[PDB]
C-alpha cells in the first residue's frame, strides 16, 4: 500500500474509475488530500485503509465495503472516510449514534426451541478484536504471536462445558486435519482477493490456529480475519441454548483478557471493533439451516426475508441469518432470527397444505 | 510485511522451519537482530525483503531466491543478507567482485545466423530499473505513474525501425487486447504467489502498459515485475540481428533517460539492478526455440546443457537460453547461446543419421 508525501496528492490519488465499493463512493480528491498525511499511533495510513478497495473494483451487481481498519484508532483518525461509509452500509447510522450491546441471554426471553423437522442446525457467531494489538491487515508476527499466546492460555484454562483443545495450523497432522475438515472446524489461507489485498495473509500460518471444546459445541479461530472468531453451534433448533453457551463462553474469555490488560476492543459508538466496517457493532451472525421446500419457491421469498430483516445463503436448505450489525444489540438480532424462522416454518407448513400465506409489515421478526 | 522495534527480535524473527529458499538459508537470529532496525532512504526494511520468502516455503525440489529489494540501496543497506545469497545463487560471486557490462553488438563478432530448419525463433530480453524510483514491491502510485510517464515519452519519441505505440492495460479495447494475445505481447496481473507476496501487484493495472514497435520486433512492458522489461525477437535464426536491434534500442531509451536525470540503475559490482537477486548483472536471457528431435531424447541432454552453460524450458521444441547473469557480460551470454545451439544442431544432424556425438568440456559454448 504506502504513500509518499513528497508526491502531489493528485499524483498519489487512486484511479477509482469503474470501482463499485463503499470506499470508492466516498473518496473525493479533497478527502484524500486532507487525510493522506495522517497516521495512527501504529503507522497505519489511509493508503492502507483503501488499498483493498483500489485493488478490487469488483462487480456492479454487488457492493463491497472496499476498505479496512488496521487499528482501533483508524476509525477515529480517518473518521471522515469511515463515517459516511458506516452510515451508508448500516442504514443511516450517524457519527453521533450509539450502539447498545446486549449479551444477557436471559433477555432472549421470548425466543425458543425451533422445529427440528425444519431446522437442521442452530448457530451464533461473532468476531472480537483484542485491545492493544493492531488488526490483521497490519499486525506484525510479534503482535500476532502475542494474540495467539494470550488467547490459547485463556482457552486452555476454561473448564467443564468449555474444556477444549488448541490446534495450530503449522504443526497439524493429517489425522488432526481430516478430523477438523469433516468436523467443519477447519480454515486455511484466504483465497479471497479482498482479504489478500489488505495484507492480512502475511506469514501464513504463523500464529494461526483452531480451538474447540470437547463437545464440539464451541469454536474459536485465532488470527484469521480478525484476532478472534467465536462460534456456538448445535444440530437442531435450540437457539436459546446456542445463544446461552455463546454468551457465557464469551464472558469467560472476556474477563481473562480484561485481567491481563487486554479487553475486547469496544466503544460506545461502534460497539465491538473489527477489521471490516460491515462487521462493526455485534459482529454477530446468528442463524439456522432450514428446510424451506415450498416457501423458497414462493414469489415473495425475497420480500419476506427483507421484512423479517433476515437474509440467506447457500447450502433446499438455506442458511438464514439476521442481517443487521450496528444499531441493534445481539439479543435483538438473535431475537429476529427466532421470530422470523418460527414464522417461516409456519408459512411452510401452510404451503405444504395448499394454503395461502401472510406477511408482516417491515422490521419485525 | 512491516516490523515493530518495541518487540524483541525473537518475537519478530520468522519461523523459517521448512522453507527452501536462498533467504531462509542465510537468515540466522543474529542477522535479523542486527539488521531489523535498519531501513533505506525510502523506508524499506528487512521485513520487506524477506516477506515473500516467509510466505513462500516452496518445494524441496527447487530453490527460489526468497527475497526482493525495494530500492537500489537495499542491496547495500542489507548487504549482509544479500551478499551471501548473491555468492550462492550466482556461483561464488564475491562481495568484492565486479560485473563487466558489454552491449557492443559488434563484439558478438563470432556469432551468427542459426539453422532455420531447427531454430524457429530467436530472442533477447533484459530488465531495467530507472534510477530515482523505488522497485515494484514498494513503489507508490505516484512513483509508478512517473516511471510510466517517463518511459512512454521516451518510447513515443523513438523513430524508424523503432517507431511504435503504447497500450495501457487500463483502457484496452477487446480488439486491442486479442491482437496482443495472439501477438504474444500481452501480460496480466501476476498469479505467482512469489510475486504477489512482495506487494508488487498493488493498484493493478494503474500505470502498467505494453509498448511495441510497428515491426513487432521490439517490445517493452512497463511496470510489471521491474520498471522496464525490454525484448528483441524474431522468427528464425538471425541471433546477430536480434542482439543488434536489442543493443541499439536499449542505448536509445538509455540516453533519453540519462538526459532527464533518470539513468538505468547500475553499479560496478552488481551491473544492472532489478528487484530479484537472481536477475542482477545483465538481467539478460537470450535464447532460441529449437527442434531437437533426437538430442532431447539422448541420455546426455541434461549434461550437454550444463557444459554449454545453457538451460531449457517448455513449449519437441525447447526454449534454450544462457543460464548466467552475474559475472559475465551480455556479449558473452548471447555468445554462449549462438555457440552451443550451433553445436547442438550439429549433434542433432548426426543422430538423424544414426551417428554418435561428442561433448565438450565445461563452460564453453
From Swiss-Prot, chains A, B:
It catalyses: creatine + ATP = N-phosphocreatine + ADP + H(+). Its EC number is 2.7.3.2. Residues 118-351 form the Phosphagen kinase C-terminal domain. Transmembrane segments: none annotated. This is Creatine kinase M-type. InterPro entries: ATP-guanido_PTrfase, ATP-guanido_PTrfase_AS, ATP-guanido_PTrfase_cat, ATP-guanido_PTrfase_N, ATP-guanido_PTrfase_N_sf, Gln_synth/guanido_kin_cat_dom. Pfam families: ATP-gua_Ptrans, ATP-gua_PtransN. It comes from Oryctolagus cuniculus (Rabbit). The gene is CKM. Residues 4-91 form the Phosphagen kinase N-terminal domain.
